[PDB]
Symmetry: D2
Subunit: 113 residues, 4 copies
Amino acid sequence: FIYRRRVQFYETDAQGIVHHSNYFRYFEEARGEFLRSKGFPYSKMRDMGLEVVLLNAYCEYKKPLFYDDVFEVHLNLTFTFSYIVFKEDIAVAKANTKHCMVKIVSIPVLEVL
Amino acid sequence: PFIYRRRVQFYETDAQGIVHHSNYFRYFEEARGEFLRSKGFPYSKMRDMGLEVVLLNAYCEYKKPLFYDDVFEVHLNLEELSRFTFTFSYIVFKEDIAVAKANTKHCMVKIVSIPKEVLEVLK
Amino acid sequence: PFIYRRRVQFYETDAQGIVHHSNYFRYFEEARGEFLRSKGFPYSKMRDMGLEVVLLNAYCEYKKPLFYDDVFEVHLNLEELSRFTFTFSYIVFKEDIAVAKANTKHCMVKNGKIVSIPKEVLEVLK
Amino acid sequence: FIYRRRVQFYETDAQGIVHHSNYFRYFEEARGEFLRSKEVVLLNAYCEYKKPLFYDDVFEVHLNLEELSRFTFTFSYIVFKEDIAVAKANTKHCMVK
C-alpha cells in the first residue's frame, strides 16, 4: 500500500525537521487508508467492538523531513505492519508496529489485510 | 490570580524556532487543570461524575514568542461565573513580561446548570 | 471563498471522543497553506523570499464537534487587508453544517521587522 | 533518572488512553531533564506498551544510560503507574555539527 502526504508546518520543531514522534502519526494515517481501501476502515471496525490496540513500535531515522516535503509511506504486512518512508524515492526512515484486537480476540478482517 | 509554572518542551516548537500558537491553548488547559485541582475538585473527578466541561470559544493574542527551554507562567483568572457558563482570562509571562493574553468560555453538559459543588470551586 | 478538504485523524481526538480544540488552529493553518499555494505563493516559497507570516491573534467558536474519520471542509475568506495586516475568517463545515467559526490576524516580517505587505503577497491575498 | 509527570487531557485519544506517539514526547522531556541534571540526532526509537495511561494519571519515567560509544549513546526507559510498569522503551542518539 502506498500512502501519500505533505509535511505540515506544525509537524516540525526548532530543529527545522519533522519531530520524530510525528512519524508514528504518519504511520497511523497510512494504516487508516490501507484499511479503508480494503473496505474495512478502522472506523466501521470499532462499531463491532473491535478496537485495534498497539503492542509495540519502532522507527529508524535515516534522513530528515522538512516542512512542505512531499513523501510516501509504504505499508506492508497479532499482526505487525512494516513501513518505509520515501522522499523522492530515497528511504528516509523504516519502521514497524505490532497490533492486536480486543472486542483480546483472534483475528476475525483477517484477509482484508 | 492562579499561577501555573511551566517550561517549553522541544516538541512544542516548530521550524520557525518558536512555540506553535496552537500549543498555547494546551498551556491554558494545563493551567485550568491545576487550578481546579488546587481547589480539591480536579476536572477528572468531574468526569467520573458524568460532568463534562464544553469549550464554547477561545481567544489568544500573541505579543512576544516563547522559545525552547523558556520558563514561563500562565496567570489564570476567573472572569465570569454565570448560571450556565464560566470564563477564564489568561496572561502568559516570561521573565515578568506579558508575551500573550487569552481567554476561554465554557459550559457544562451532563446543556445543564453549573452544579452547586462546581460553582463552589470556581468562585 | 477557498475550500480546504480534510478528514479527521484518530490522534487528533482526545478522551472526550472529539477533536481537541487546539487542533482546529492546525486545520486553519493547513487551509491557509493550500490557499497560498493554490495562488502561486506557497508559504514555503515566501519563507525563501525572506518573508515570515506572523500570527497576531486567533479566535475560534465551537458549535458542534468533529469525530474520528469525519469528513469536513474549511472554507476561508479574506476579511481585511491593510498595508501591514490581513485577516482570514474560517467556517468549518461538516455535511454542509457550520460546526465552527474562527478568524486569525497576521502580519509580515522580514529580517526582524514588520514590513509593508509586498505587492507580491498583496496580489495573491485580495 | 527519575522523571515525574501527569497525563494531560490533550495527550489522550478517542479510545480514552494516551496516544502511543505521545510516549516519545515524554521520553524527550525525561531525557531533557536528565541532561540538565548533569545538535543531537535521533537514530531510532522503540516502545512496548503493556498497560495504558489515562487522563491525568500520575506516572514515573525511569531513565537509564544503557550503551555508550564514541559515536552514539542509548537510553532505556520504563514507565511506572503506581507499582506497575506500563511501558518499556529505548532510543539511540548521535551528534552532528
